[PDB]
Design a protein around this ligand. Structure first.
Ligand code: ACO
Ligand code: MG
Length: 729
């Protein structure tokens, strides 16, 4: 609340950020401090005009599309005229000739491994530590702790060990072992013990013994060969470890002394500066940069009271190899960082360069410079840098969200190239995970990949943002279907398949990930285990999970599905055509009964209010919010973008009135208040709605949603959160 900036060329840097970089981030990188700030100045000055121009192009194209629809209120749908219009204005560009990506220096977790990808807010060090440590997770804990095992018929969890439930957990895991690492002519249900003989696993049974059906799945062990403490296996590139301890509580109940089954699961994790965090000023950005620093130095630590212990990063895992010697496996998830996209500025730095009268600096430019600087530590194993490293191949991994078309991808790659120059890194060190989550990227996806052909390490269908962009782009065309019906549309099915087809045709298999989206129903893990197998069956080598527990459970899908075999079968197929993508999800006439309209409005208002109140009042960018059906949903800015754009579209076309929307907000706010009543830090919105900055922010997101650029929620959220911060101070 006290302005204090340091001059650095044309820049005026908030002292908290200046000091953080100079005293915490720079030492150990061998980068001269004066040269670094001179580089920040030069990059910001050189690249800001193109950043501004790209955003202006977004606005110009949207205005042209708006006008096209308004000229044709009574004309029938004409896919040909519409597509030809989008081509004529430069929205749809020609597809390049076939090509193969050339990205090299990439880690095995990305190039040749299929498995879960975790995402976590970087401002929460407790969660970030758990996420980096989620590469290895207990299957017993994940089954015991979720509804994958029913609690009915005396199988309640409690807070201790209910043996009725524990026996069901053991049985479920025995079946998983039979399915994934089968014995020759036997079931693990009949195991009485384990031994290593002549470098191969021997499983003792009731009166005989058995080998693995494929002895090559044996990867290592701990303890002695005659009485091992664990058996390490591998299947479909992922490790499985059976822990043996007949003295443990669980092992003493087990016919073979088995205590747990550990799955390698969150092979990679995205440390998120974007949609799951609330960071609106220098203080917030420094908190995130400091946690990213602790992860890359390896020394991040957090005291956790649950008793109190000190959470730290896991060491690598060591085993005796089958034929002797020492096997070392990575103990931690390979880390990406998701920077913010091209839209927002942040006043952590203001620039006077070239006419700018102290203009806040583009935040995506700052993220590339600062998260790139900090990532140098993850490449070095020294006392000055910390001994724990991230990449084993010399790369830095940045997810770049919310890009619109190939010029915007080219800009990201030029930004990374310029940052590499400032940091003294080899050209190409900074790799890019491209989110396919905006319509102008989907429709030009081949060209987007080509613009990053030597840097790209994944594409991923960010289907939630993509649905928000779908609604905003065609805002003027007519009222859209309810948001729960979007999953059944022609456009979304083509969007998912075209992503996979385009990535495979660009040579992604064996070089880069093809990824799919987040499971949002945080408590419905039985449903996740049933349904989310569709993503690996679709040829995605990774997909997003909301927690370490969900990562462990989703890992089972990669043992059931041979994703790389699926990709081989998909090669050469073109399963979609352009007019499918251009099929706007408009509602039919007389689509809804009044009660259906009411449910959609109330559900959207409840989920908006439940997310926004914690964003504005507590700076929490990701919350579990029960919807109108009492399903607990992960909410972040992308889910908010959908709900607010849908209501804005229904207002635009007179499905509801502004009075209806305000009435729904007033109806749902006290229900949100009641859901949060247990939280001692909660500030109720009701009854004085207009005195709550959080309530007013939710109202703005709806009533002014049609005016937000591409439907983005950050302009309002950032303005209102800064208002609350200044008021609370
Ligand atoms: C469309 C998109 O952009 S999706 C990508 C952005 N989405 C994300 O990043 C999802 C992040 N997930 C989260 O923040 C959480 O899972 C939430 C908010 C949904 C639920 O968490 P909460 O309501 O705070 O409490 P909950 O009891 O369910 O979980 C807390 C426990 O689970 C752990 N945990 C929960 N989520 C995560 C996570 N993403 N990563 C690591 N650990 C996690 C916590 O460390 C904690 O355990 P601990 O006591 O040992 O520290
Ligand atoms: Mg997104």
């Amino acid at each position: 609340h006290m302005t204090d900036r340091v001059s650095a060329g044309n820049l005026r840097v908030a002292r908290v950020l200046y000091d953080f970089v100079n005293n915490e981030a720079l030492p150990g990188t061998d980068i001269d401090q004066d040269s670094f700030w001179a580089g920040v100045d030069k990059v910001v000055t050189d690249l800001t005009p193109q950043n501004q121009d790209l955003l202006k192009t977004r606005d110009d194209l949207q205005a042209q599309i708006d006008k096209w629809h308004r000229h044709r209120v009574i004309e029938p749908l004409d896919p040909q005229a519409y597509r030809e219009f989008l081509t004529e204005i430069g929205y749809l560009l020609p597809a390049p000739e076939d090509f193969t990506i050339t990205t090299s220096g990439v880690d095995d977790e990305i190039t040749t491994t299929a498995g879960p990808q975790l995402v976590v807010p970087i401002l929460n060090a407790r969660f970030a530590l758990n996420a980096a440590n989620a590469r290895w997770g207990s299957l017993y804990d994940a089954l015991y702790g979720t509804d994958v095992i029913s609690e009915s018929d005396g199988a309640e969890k409690g807070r201790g060990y209910n043996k009725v439930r524990g026996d069901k957990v053991i049985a479920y895991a025995r079946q998983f072992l039979d399915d994934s690492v089968p014995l020759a002519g036997a079931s693990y249900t009949d195991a009485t013990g384990f031994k290593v003989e002549d470098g191969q696993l021997v499983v003792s049974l009731a009166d005989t013994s058995a080998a693995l059906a494929d002895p090559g799945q044996f990867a290592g062990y701990t303890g002695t060969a005659e009485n091992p403490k664990s058996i390490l296996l591998a299947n479909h590139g992922l490790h499985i470890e059976i822990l043996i301890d007949p003295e443990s509580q669980i092992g003493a109940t087990d016919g073979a002394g088995v205590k747990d089954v550990i799955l390698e699961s969150a092979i990679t994790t995205i440390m998120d500066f974007e949609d799951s965090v609330a960071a609106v000023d220098a203080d917030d950005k420094v908190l995130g940069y400091r946690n990213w620093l602790g992860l890359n130095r390896g020394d991040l630590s957090e005291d956790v009271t649950k008793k109190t212990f000190t959470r730290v990063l896991n060491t690598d895992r060591t085993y005796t190899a089958p034929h002797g010697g020492e096997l070392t496996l990575p103990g931690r998830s390979l880390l990406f960082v998701r920077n913010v996209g091209h839209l927002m500025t942040n006043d952590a730095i203001v620039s006077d360069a070239e006419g700018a009268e102290g203009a806040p600096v583009f935040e995506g430019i700052m993220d590339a410079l600062f998260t790139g600087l900090i990532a140098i530590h993850g490449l070095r194993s020294t006392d000055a840098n910390g001994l724990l490293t991230n990449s084993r191949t010399g790369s830095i991994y940045i997810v770049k969200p919310k890009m619109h078309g190939p010029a915007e991808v080219a800009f990201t790659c030029e930004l990374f190239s310029r940052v590499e120059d400032v940091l003294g890194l080899p050209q190409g060190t900074m790799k890019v995970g491209i989110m396919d989550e905006e319509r102008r990227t989907t429709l030009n996806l081949k060209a987007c990949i080509k613009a990053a052909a030597d840097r790209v390490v994944f594409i991923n269908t960010g289907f939630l943002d993509r649905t928000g962009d779908e609604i905003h782009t065609s805002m003027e065309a007519g009222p859209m279907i309810r948001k729960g019906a979007m999953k059944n549309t022609a456009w979304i099915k083509a969007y998912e398949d075209a992503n996979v087809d385009t990535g495979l045709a660009a040579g992604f298999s064996g070089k880069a990930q093809i990824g799919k989206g987040m499971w949002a129903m945080t408590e419905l893990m039985a449903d996740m285990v049933e349904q989310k197998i569709a993503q690996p069956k679709a040829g995605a080598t990774t997909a997003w999970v909301p927690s370490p527990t969900a990562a462990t459970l989703h890992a089972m899908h990669y043992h059931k599905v041979d994703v790389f075999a699926v990709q081989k079968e998909l090669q050469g197929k073109t399963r979609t055509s352009v007019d499918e993508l251009l099929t706007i999800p408009l509602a039919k006439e007389l689509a809804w009964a009044p009660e259906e309209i009411r449910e959609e409005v109330d559900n959207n208002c409840q989920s908006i209010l439940g997310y926004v109140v914690r964003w504005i009042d507590q700076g929490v960018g990701c919350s579990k919010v029960p919807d109108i059906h009492n399903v607990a949903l992960m909410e972040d800015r992308a889910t908010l973008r959908i709900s607010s754009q849908l209501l804005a579209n229904w207002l635009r076309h007179g499905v509801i009135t502004s009075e209806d929307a305000r009435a729904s907000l007033e109806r749902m706010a006290p229900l949100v208040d009641k859901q949060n009543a247990g939280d001692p830090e909660y500030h109720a919105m009701a009854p004085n709605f207009d005195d709550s900055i959080a309530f007013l922010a939710a109202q703005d997101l709806i009533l002014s949603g049609a005016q937000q650029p591409n439907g983005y929620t950050e302009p309002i959220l950032h303005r209102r959160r800064r208002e609350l911060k200044a008021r609370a101070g």
